[PDB]
Design a protein around this ligand. Structure first.
Ligand code: SF4
Ligand code: SF4
Ligand code: SF4
Ligand code: SF4
Ligand code: FES
Ligand SMILES: [K+]
Ligand SMILES: [Zn+2]
Lengths: 48, 129, 96, 115, 209, 87, 106, 699
């Protein structure tokens, strides 16, 4: 890379990270979608 | 003719005991014997030729970790293909599944006339091509 | 860009964030929630619009065979910009 | 059409003779099974299980189906006698970890949608 | 044969296999129901299930046959037929450098004569068919499961058997052993509908009912 | 109490077995409804059913009377027994 | 190069995947773009066959050059869209150089 | 007899004269390629994809438009035929955009599929492509018109099926563009069907845009319940979620179309959903609880009360199983007060005879009628596919249609006799000229909308219209078995409720205010707490928090029509059963199971514990409710009329104004459609224009 450097993009990380497994920086998987079914919220007034 | 020396069994064929299927997936499952309906989005009719047998839909839920669709139904993706309704029914009977058959829906023949688009005294005249 | 909830959790580019009462945010205790920080919706908006001198322009994403399939964009409407359906670049006709 | 090639038995009397013969072999073998595999069950428990497995198919009336169940029963006996099965395979008959599932309507109604 | 992308047709082998097909049907009319040759030159003899031993012995031992090797013996499940199982024997003649296929049929409750007397290769092939399709072979030296787990219930290669089966295994610490539980999947297998609604092969179009 | 709440008559549109019940409905049903203004008498038809007379009293008890191959006169008595005598 | 995502939620990688390792969900974005809300690769289902990068029409999904990503837990190998976008951002410099060397054979 | 013999690939087939070469190939099983031809639209002949060789004829013929002639041999697989197909497919793809990845039609596209099967495998087009600007025709149909292939199916459909002449071609040549020319919306109760007939991604569903792919959806063949037509549908699901609704062809009901309420209201199933049982706390607020607790509170009140003190109102979207189960439970406390929100006059025969409250002629019979008299109904918005059947008969049979009611656009011209109900008396006597038209008609048809009967004078109108039907049937030369009187319902559960003996309308509940009320999905607002003893204990069962839930003591979540296998009876009396597509959300349970569970807690256990047993019970109450897809005819019209005359009620002088007058009243009519945000944008679009409904669309 000193002779043929890589192309620069803005989004490319400026600081490489090594394997973080087993540390507080590890990756925890999670669902990235939002809630599908919205639940009716009962009225907060005393009715009758 | 065939000379194996044969017996005569007059009972109905019933193979549930020898199939290895658990109890709950024979007594409680309702099969649907049907010809699939043509997908309305297309005009091809080659997927409406054969009879199908599918099972009632049971619960799917969200996996707590990734949100994937989890199931406890071993027959959820099970589909069988038959040439006739009588073939599909016989298979369900010997396997002990209860079934609701649905008769094939055949498109009716229509009367198409290109000359009717320019009729002289009828409403079939088109205002555009 | 990245927002945070009142609970402190980061909101991802899809808008996901565990709500106040969800127990599933326990998976991040002692660890971290991985959110990519370069929201493509923000980045594609920073691009300048390209002024062209024809009704119809083609976009292939740049790089030739390394982009997307080539498509043509009609630029007759002057109340909006033409947008690539693949890459999101914007084009406008130059008052011809 | 009702004429069908026999597997072994020509009628249900010949088939039930093989059912009893297989029950004797399984009945005799349970004490050895509990000993060799070092099962914590009692020999009475093992014989109640063998009996139970034999009542599931008590409604059958087709000689050919009866023969197959006997063929499969003798195959399972050989795996047990020759110790091809392991302790985990023997104890799968007793479903020791499966939690009891409700049979009535209300208990089944509270848990979910299954019939 | 000069179309770069199209498999060339070998008319000479088609004629020879057609002739030998009639030959087998003339000598064994008692068992042979159908004889056919494919467009890529593979001869098939369809027989009554009673003729397994006579047909296989003639092909192995006849001097104008000499199919001394059993390449394969397998089963196909077709639920739409009353005889849902199609038993297929693939045989190789090293003398004449030919292959032939012999097919017969059965159902769940009907035995098929074990062909171990003709080919000793068939012993394990029949155990496999018994285990995966539940077809019983009469007079087998030892018929028992070969591929499935000990005590496994069912015959997995039947079209009506579920892909993921009915039981799964885990190690339970309470009982200090591997236990079997009903099967649940964190992600259900996703069934894709792929068949196109437009006919692809007119030459195989079946007649209207 | 313990009085009749509802009557249902099931019959086939065309089968010979129901011929008696059809005659009753054509001739005598109008009077029956005018006699019992508030009692719901539900005449529900369906092809190829063995005709029956369902009567529902208080608290869900029900009785079924076959009418297969009855005559219009017999159907009238069958209804009379139900209307008059109430369990 | 602008920083917009290449993936258009066409789901051909999902269909071709022999292992059913890919789960995708999509919807219109605020600007109306066709984009994924879910892009999961189960790395313990995947056979690393590369059919998904062959199928993709926009080079959005690639198997990178990295082979040194062992984990201490099974959950760390179930990748969602954020992890995969971070892999591309992390490894873009090398990935692009390799695609440059091979795209004339593809 | 009149049949002529033609050959398809050397195979003889006997066809009626007038059969097209394309239809002759159908009878041997061969499907000719097509793009512009649709069996339910007029022949166009513009795509040229059906060109086929005729043996011993030099020029290929368009199969879709060419009638066969005696002795013709159609060569569908000939070299001349195949080369025609590759050429035409080559032209169709020359200017088509490379959009398949970003196009919702991908995977279910007749252009893609017919390219694979009848087109070349490569391109020799080395020029630039045409790019067309996109057009906004409303909130429900997205237009990427660069994908259009100019088949004019949308034009022919909108003109001929939907009776709307707003789509056309502008310009000519390669620049001929489909659209409206001006900025206009193609908003119709049937507008969403152009999406299906468009063979390409030019017209796609906006609500469905980008969410799924065809191959990954599971198809569940179910029934629509947004009205009383009973349209057969396909519910597409993926990973336990409903993705879209599609029509399923049923010839004798909906043909192959559905209304836009049926097609785009499913998004209402994901909002305002009841998912947990609820009881009132000390502060008087609804709070979540368990099934054990809620059903023990309902059983306590159910056991204490008895007789008339217990009542129930059923809503529009309630199936037969939940109806019979609740009738049995209330009968065991000795309550007959099973009411419905929809009113049907009870004087006379009432519900005793089926023929009194059914559309006896059936939807398919409309095509055989000679005169149709619509009384006090807007069938366009009450029964969109029934109205579409009238227009098909208007178009192809020269049907004469007359209307007694407010003048509403039905998409086809009609004879407006007037709006006053008194005209019905004139027609019967013979004063009004239309009476001759009805008398001479060989097969007349009279249709009374159930919306007319909601008036206080309903018993009068039903008597009058029934009288008109009898004279022209008995006292005129109408065929023996042509049934004239018809009632058009608008509520999915009505016909099933009436078959089970439910009392139509909430009159009984008003006459005897009960101390316990079961609101079985009753969201009509017919009975409010100002009409109740003030200590009333209301148990609401349903799937949406709308009107009933906020006024209830106990909420028992149920399943929507997509989440259960339930029986519904359409306006003709046909019984049809849905299937489970997805299971109920949260703690929601099947509707009849809640009642069976409640009955056991109250020591009143019902004699059915499975779906098959609760359908044997339906067979004991009405045998027709378990004959699926079979229309059981009714009869005894003469007897029904006799009882009708006795009372003689008096008509009022109010004009017959239908509840729905313009398209804006069509979209939001029940709890599912009120919760839908797509129907919310539909209502906004037709009342405010496209200014605030537009969304930027790129692909
Ligand atoms: S490399 Fe992995 S994710 Fe990609 S197609 Fe192959 S198995 Fe699927
Ligand atoms: S990664 Fe590529 S193939 Fe997969 S959905 Fe995105 S654009 Fe389509
Ligand atoms: S309509 Fe869409 S899916 Fe069909 S060929 Fe055109 S771009 Fe591809
Ligand atoms: S918009 Fe669709 S249906 Fe209308 S002409 Fe174009 S391709 Fe045909
Ligand atoms: S289908 Fe015949 S020309 Fe279009
Ligand atoms: K379309
Ligand atoms: Zn682009």
């Amino acid at each position: 890379p000193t002779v043929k450097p890589p192309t620069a993009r803005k989004f490319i990380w400026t600081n490489h990270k090594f394997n973080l497994s087993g540390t507080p920086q590890q990756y925890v998987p999670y669902s990235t979608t939002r809630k599908k079914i919205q639940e009716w919220v009962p009225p907060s007034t005393p009715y009758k | 003719t065939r000379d194996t020396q044969l017996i005569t069994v007059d009972e109905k064929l019933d193979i549930t005991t020898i199939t290895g299927v658990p109890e709950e997936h024979i007594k409680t499952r309702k099969a649907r014997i049907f010809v699939p309906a043509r997908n309305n989005m297309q005009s091809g009719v080659n997927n409406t030729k054969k009879w199908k047998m599918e099972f009632d839909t049971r619960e799917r839920w969200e996996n707590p970790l990734m949100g994937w669709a989890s199931t406890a139904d071993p027959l959820s993706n099970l589909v069988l293909t038959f040439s006739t309704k009588e073939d599909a029914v016989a298979f369900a009977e010997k396997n002990g599944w209860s079934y609701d058959v649905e008769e094939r829906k055949v498109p009716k023949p229509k009367s198409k006339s290109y000359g009717a688009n320019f009729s002289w005294n009828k409403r079939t005249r088109v205002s555009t091509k | 860009g990245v927002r945070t909830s009142p609970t402190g959790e980061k909101v991802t580019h899809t808008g996901q964030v565990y709500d106040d009462g969800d127990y599933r945010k326990v998976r991040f205790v002692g660890r971290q929630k991985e959110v990519n920080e370069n929201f493509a919706i923000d980045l594609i908006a920073e691009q300048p619009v390209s002024q062209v001198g024809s009704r119809v322009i083609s976009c292939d994403g740049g790089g030739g065979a390394l982009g997307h399939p080539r498509v043509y964009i009609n630029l007759d409407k002057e109340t909006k910009t033409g947008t690539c359906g693949y890459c999101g670049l914007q084009f406008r006709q130059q008052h011809h | 059409s009702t004429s069908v090639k026999p597997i072994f038995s020509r009628d249900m009397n010949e088939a039930k003779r093989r059912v009893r013969e297989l029950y004797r072999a399984w009945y005799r073998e349970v004490p050895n099974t509990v000993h060799l595999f070092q099962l914590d069950i009692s020999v009475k428990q093992g014989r109640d299980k063998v009996r139970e497995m034999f009542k599931k198919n008590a409604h059958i009336t087709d000689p050919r189906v009866v023969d197959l169940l006997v063929i499969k029963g003798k195959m399972e006996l050989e795996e047990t006698i020759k110790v091809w099965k392991q302790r985990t395979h023997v104890m799968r008959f007793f479903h020791e970890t499966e939690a009891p599932r409700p049979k009535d309507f209300l208990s089944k109604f509270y848990v979910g949608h299954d019939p | 044969d000069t179309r770069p992308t199209v498999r060339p047709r070998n008319d000479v082998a088609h004629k020879q296999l057609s002739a030998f097909g009639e030959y087998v049907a003339e000598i064994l009319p008692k068992y042979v129901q159908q004889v056919q040759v494919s467009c890529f030159n593979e001869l098939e003899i369809c027989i009554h299930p009673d003729g397994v031993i006579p047909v296989l012995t003639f092909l192995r031992d006849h001097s104008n046959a000499q199919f001394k090797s059993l390449a394969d013996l397998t089963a196909v499940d077709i639920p739409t037929r009353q005889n849902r199982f199609e038993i297929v024997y693939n045989l190789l003649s090293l003398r004449f450098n030919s292959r032939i296929r012999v097919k017969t049929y059965t159902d769940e409750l009907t035995p098929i004569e074990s062909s171990v007397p003709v080919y000793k290769a068939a012993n394990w092939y029949e155990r496999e068919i018994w285990d995966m399709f539940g077809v019983f072979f009469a007079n087998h030296p030892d018929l028992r499961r070969i591929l499935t787990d000990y005590g496994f219930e069912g015959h997995p290669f039947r079209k009506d058997f579920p892909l993921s089966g009915y039981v799964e295994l885990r190690y339970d610490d309470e009982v200090k052993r591997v236990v079997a539980e009903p099967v649940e999947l964190a992600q259900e297998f996703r069934k894709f509908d792929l068949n196109s609604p437009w006919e692809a092969f007119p030459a195989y179009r079946q007649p209207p009912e | 109490k313990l009085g009749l709440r509802e009557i249902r008559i099931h019959l086939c549109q065309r089968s010979p077995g129901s011929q008696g019940v059809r005659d009753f409905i054509e001739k005598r049903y109008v009077e029956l409804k005018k006699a019992n203004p508030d009692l719901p008498i539900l005449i529900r038809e369906c092809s190829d059913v063995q005709p029956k007379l369902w009567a529902r009293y208080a608290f869900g008890q029900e009785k079924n009377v076959s009418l297969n191959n009855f005559s219009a006169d017999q159907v009238t008595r069958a209804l009379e027994n139900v209307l008059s005598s109430k369990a | 190069p602008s920083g917009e995502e290449r993936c258009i939620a066409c789901k051909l990688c999902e269909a071709v995947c022999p292992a059913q390792a890919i789960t995708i969900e999509a919807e219109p974005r605020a600007d109306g773009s066709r984009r994924t809300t879910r892009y999961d690769i189960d790395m313990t289902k995947c056979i690393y066959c590369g059919f998904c990068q062959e199928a993709c029409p926009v080079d959005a999904i690639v198997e990178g050059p990295n082979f040194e990503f062992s984990t201490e837990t099974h959950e760390e190998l179930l990748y969602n869209k954020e992890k995969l976008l971070n892999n591309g951002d992390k490894w873009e410099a090398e990935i692009a150089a390799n695609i440059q060397a091979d795209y004339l054979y593809r | 007899s009149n049949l002529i013999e033609v050959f398809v690939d050397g195979q003889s087939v006997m066809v009626e004269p007038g059969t097209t070469v394309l239809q002759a190939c159908e009878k041997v099983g061969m499907q000719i390629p097509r793009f512009c031809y649709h069996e339910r639209l007029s022949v166009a002949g513009n795509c040229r994809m059906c060109l086929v060789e005729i043996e011993k004829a030099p020029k290929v013929v368009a199969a879709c438009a060419m009638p066969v002639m005696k002795g013709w041999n159609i060569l569908t697989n000939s070299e001349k035929t195949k080369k025609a197909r590759e050429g035409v497919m080559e032209f169709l793809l020359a200017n088509h955009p490379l959009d398949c990845p970003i196009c919702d039609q991908g995977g279910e596209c007749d252009l893609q599929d017919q390219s694979m099967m009848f087109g070349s495998d490569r391109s020799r087009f080395l020029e630039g492509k045409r790019a067309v600007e996109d057009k906004n025709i409303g909130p429900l149909v997205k237009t990427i018109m660069t994908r259009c292939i100019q088949c004019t199916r949308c034009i022919r459909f909108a003109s001929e099926i939907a009776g709307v002449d707003d789509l056309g071609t502008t310009g000519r040549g390669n620049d001929m563009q489909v659209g409206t020319y001006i900025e206009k919306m193609f908003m119709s109760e049937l507008s969403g069907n152009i999406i299906d007939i468009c063979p390409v991604g030019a017209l796609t569903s906006k609500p469905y845009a980008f969410t799924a792919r065809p191959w990954e959806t599971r198809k569940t063949e179910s029934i629509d319940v947004m009205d009383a037509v009973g349209s057969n549908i396909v519910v597409s699901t993926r990973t336990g979620e409903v993705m879209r609704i599609l029509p399923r062809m049923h010839e004798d009901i909906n043909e192959e179309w559905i209304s836009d309420k049926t097609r785009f209201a499913y998004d209402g199933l994901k909002r305002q959903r009841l998912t947990e049982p609820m009881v009132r706390n000390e502060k008087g607020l609804l709070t979540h609880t368990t099934w054990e607790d809620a059903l023990s509170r309902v059983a306590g009140m159910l056991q204490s009360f008895q007789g008339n003190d217990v009542a129930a109102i059923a809503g529009g979207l309630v199936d037969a199983e939940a109806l019979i189960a609740l009738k049995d439970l209330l009968n065991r406390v000795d309550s007959d007060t099973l009411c419905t929100e929809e009113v049907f006059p009870t004087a006379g025969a009432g519900t005793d005879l089926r023929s009194n409250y059914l559309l006896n002629t059936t939807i398919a019979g409309v095509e055989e009628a000679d005169v149709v008299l619509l009384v006090g109904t807007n069938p366009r918005f009450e029964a969109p596919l029934f109205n579409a059947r009238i227009r098909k008969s208007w178009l192809h049979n020269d049907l004469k249609v007359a209307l007694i009611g407010s003048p509403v656009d039905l998409t086809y011209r009609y004879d407006h006799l007037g709006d006053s109900p008194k005209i019905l008396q004139d027609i019967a006597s013979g004063s009004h000229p239309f009476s001759q038209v009805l008398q001479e008609a060989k097969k007349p048809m009279v249709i009374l909308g159930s919306s007319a009967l909601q008036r206080n004078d309903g018993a009068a109108i039903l008597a009058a219209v029934s009288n008109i039907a009898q004279k022209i049937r008995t006292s005129s030369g109408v065929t023996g078995d042509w049934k004239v009187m018809n009632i058009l319902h608008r509520i999915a559960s009505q016909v099933a409720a009436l078959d089970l003996g439910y009392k139509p309308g909430v009159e009984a509940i008003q006459k005897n205010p009960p101390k316990m009320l079961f609101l079985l999905g009753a969201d009509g607002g017919c009975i409010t707490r100002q009409d109740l003893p003030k200590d009333c204990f209301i148990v609401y069962q349903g799937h949406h928090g709308d009107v009933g839930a906020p006024i209830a003591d106990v909420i028992l979540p149920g399943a929507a029509y997509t989440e259960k296998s339930a029986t519904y009876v359409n306006t003709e009396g046909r019984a049809q059963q849905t299937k489970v597509a997805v299971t109920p959300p949260g703690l929601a349970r099947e509707d009849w199971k809640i009642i069976r569970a409640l009955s056991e807690i109250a020591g009143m256990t019902l004699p059915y514990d499975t779906l098959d047993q609760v359908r044997n019970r339906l067979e004991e109450v009405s045998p027709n409710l378990v004959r699926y897809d079979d229309v059981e005819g009714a009869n005894y019209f003469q007897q029904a009329s006799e009882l009708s005359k006795l009372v003689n009620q008096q008509l009022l002088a109010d004009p017959l104004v239908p509840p729905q007058l313009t398209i804006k009243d069509f979209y939001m009519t029940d709890s599912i459609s009120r919760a839908s945000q797509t129907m919310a944008k539909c209502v906004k679009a037709v009342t405010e224009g496209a200014h605030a409904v537009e969304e930027p669309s790129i692909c």
